[PDB]
Amino acid sequence: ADAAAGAQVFAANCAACHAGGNNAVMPTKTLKADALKTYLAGYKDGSKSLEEAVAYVVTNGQGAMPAFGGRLSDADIANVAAYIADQAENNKW
Numbered sequence: 001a002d003a004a005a006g007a008q009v010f011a012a013n014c015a016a017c018h019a020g021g022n023n024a025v026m027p028t029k030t031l032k033a034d035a036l037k038t039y040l041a042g043y044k045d046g047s048k049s050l051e052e053a054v055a056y057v058v059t060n061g062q063g064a065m066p067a068f069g070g071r072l073s074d075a076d077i078a079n080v081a082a083y084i085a086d087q088a089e090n091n092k093w
């Protein structure tokens with residue numbers, strides 16, 4: 001999906017909890033490449049791509065993280081997932 005478009009999604013929906021690609025609530029579970037491969041469901045076990053796994057967690061929530069399905073458009077979810085994947089894989093946080 002569109003990483004560049006996802007940056008704005010992120011700014012509007014995700015930065016209060018994940019500023020800097022970090023995690024204010026659960027500090028180990030950051031959006032950096034190493035943490036994502038350790039902790040993010042689906043991605044960590046090899047059964048999902050990073051982008052899909054981010055799309056899933058955004059849509060459905062996890063633990064303390066709210067769900068965004070029904071709050072964000074399908075494109076917005078897809079694009080923010082692409083932004084996370086791009087930031088992480090390219091070490092841009």
Ligand code: HEC
Nearest residue numbers: 013014017025026029030035036039040054062063064065
């Ligand atoms: C605070 C109220 C949050 C908001 C808003 C968003 N996220 Fe979040 N996220 C939060 C927590 C507490 C966690 C940990 C969940 C757990 O495993 O217990 C997460 C996790 C993620 C992850 C996985 C990180 C990892 O496992 O290392 C991703 C990819 C993620 N969050 C992305 C994300 C996006 C893109 C958001 C805006 C749409 C967003 N989160 C909101 C807390 C909060």
